[PDB]
Design a protein around this nucleic acid. Sequence first.
RNA 1: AGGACAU
Length: 157
Amino acid sequence: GAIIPPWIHVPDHSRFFVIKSSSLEHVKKSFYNGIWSSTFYGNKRLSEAYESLPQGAKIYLLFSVNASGRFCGVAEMSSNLREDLDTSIWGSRYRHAFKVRWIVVRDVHNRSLKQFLIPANDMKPVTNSRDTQEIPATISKSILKLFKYVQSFLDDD
RNA sequence: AGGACAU
């Protein structure tokens, strides 16, 4: 069931964010529907980072369900925030969303990531990040290595 | 605290 691409090419000047979800099902809806949405402030943060990118660069989203003990996949932003997308799939609180392109669907346990300490987050491990916590690039590429190296939320389908 | 942090 997992989706693990042979390579991930990360364009220079790209940025990386932890995405958290209170629900595995919202994540699945993201995969099938190619959209995601964050909080009021979370969206503002992602929207601003996405607008700021030099041309080739991307924004990577590393997904993790709350209290799940793992990360479960990787997506890119493929649009800025829009209003004309179908946010009814989340029922509410997420009135805007942006397009995402899924790259990796695979579980990676927190155990395997708790070595990566985030300097701008008081040296806390990446596994202890809030939604839209930014990750430095060199640390991110190491994490991406772990994603491409087996369970997935696409198995019971 | 108008924010989908860990065991």
